[PDB]
Structure formats: structure tokens, C-alpha cells
Point group: D2
Chain length 26, copies 4
Amino acid sequence: GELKAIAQELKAIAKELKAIAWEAKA
Amino acid sequence: GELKAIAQELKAIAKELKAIAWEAKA
Amino acid sequence: GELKAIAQELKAIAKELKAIAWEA
Amino acid sequence: GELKAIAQELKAIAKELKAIAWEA
Ligand code: NA
Ligand code: NA
């Protein structure tokens, strides 16, 4: 349960960092 | 560049934690 | 900024994972 | 164990993000 929730959190952080990486490019 | 690579790393950690969460269940 | 807030998030998760390791 | 190694990974990334924040 707790590890699955933390896994989803880390996936979401990954998407947030990718969006920041993109905004920096554009 | 570096943020995109770290984003991929965090996605991969997410899959590793999800696999650990699963192994624990089964 | 925003990256610092994410960095703190990751350090919080690291503490949670260490706690889970020792829970079982 | 394995979770501790991932926790250390996350603390390493947190330091990288803090460095990127201050790079620019
Ligand atoms: Na979650
Ligand atoms: Na990578």
C-alpha cells in the first residue's frame, strides 16, 4: 500500500521535473 | 538535459518501488 | 524555489522508505 | 537493504536538484 502510493508520487514528481525541463527549453 | 535525465531516473525508481510493493504482496 | 521544494519532497520520501525497510 | 539504497539515490537527486536551482 504505502510503497505503491510513494511510487505514484515519484512518477508525478518525474512529470513535474520534465515539465520544468521543458519550460526551461521554451 | 540534466532535469530530463533525472525525471527518467525518478520514473524508473517509481517502477522499482512498485515491483518491490508487488513482491511483498505475492 | 520549486526545485528546492521537490528536493525536500525527495528527502521526505527517502526517510519514509528507510522507515518501511525497518518496519518489516 | 534495497530500500535504503533507493533512499540514498533520492537524497543524491535532491542535492542535484538544489545545485540546478542555483546553477541558473
Ligand atoms: Na500517491
Ligand atoms: Na536517466
